[PDB]
């Protein structure tokens, strides 16, 4: 029996976004800054 | 007229959405089966002044 949800295709964050605090602030918005894990991956490339 | 089941309707089955029959219908007997020894009864039947 499977208690967890039945999928085999995870939504893997392949390339992370550019973490930056010096220049171009506000282009990216993570859910980690609000103490929350995102449902969907967060980065440049997210291969299924 | 012999009783197969004894139920307790929290709501009438005409008005029972998400129909939930009583847990008493899971047992074979309509009530709680209490095993009794018949040899212990017939001694009590055949004595007892």
């Amino acid at each position: 029996e499977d208690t967890g949800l039945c999928t085999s295709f995870m939504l893997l964050d392949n390339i992370p976004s550019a973490h930056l605090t010096k220049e171009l602030i506000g282009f990216t918005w993570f859910m980690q800054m609000y103490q929350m894990t995102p449902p969907l991956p967060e980065g440049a490339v997210n291969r299924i | 007229d012999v009783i197969t089941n004894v139920l307790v309707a929290r709501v009438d089955p005409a008005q029972r959405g998400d129909a939930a029959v009583d847990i008493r219908a899971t047992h074979a007997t309509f009530a709680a089966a209490l095993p009794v020894d018949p040899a212990a009864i017939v001694v009590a039947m055949l004595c007892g002044q």
Partner: protein
Amino acid sequence: LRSNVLLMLLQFTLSNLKINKSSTFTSDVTTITSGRMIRAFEGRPELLALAYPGRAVLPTQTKNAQFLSTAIADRIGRLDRANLIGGEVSAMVECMELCDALTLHIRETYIMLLRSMHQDPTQIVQIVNECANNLLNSTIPISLRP
């Protein structure tokens, strides 16, 4: 390549031969979906966020938020808990959650495999009696078994 690909698809299928066990459903007391019977996990609490994209908070206009804003609110949690006995566990819930269509199809034909070899106790009390040639006392209770 055709032999290697066909072999991992049987690695894919036999790994998915499981039963979708129902779990506990808690009412969403918070305001995110407000009463939809979501599935708390309590063995992996991180899995609740990835299960339900409808419960995502959308603070900014993220590119994910460009997508998750279009999520319909009543597409989450269970829909019809097909329950039979009050006080006893329901036999078959019907929920929407994150799930691929392929692994679900492997699992639904696996229950159909397990239903293909299941007989109710009216039949299996004959099979035990006929394998014992009608002797060796066997007693089935005539009542519901969900």
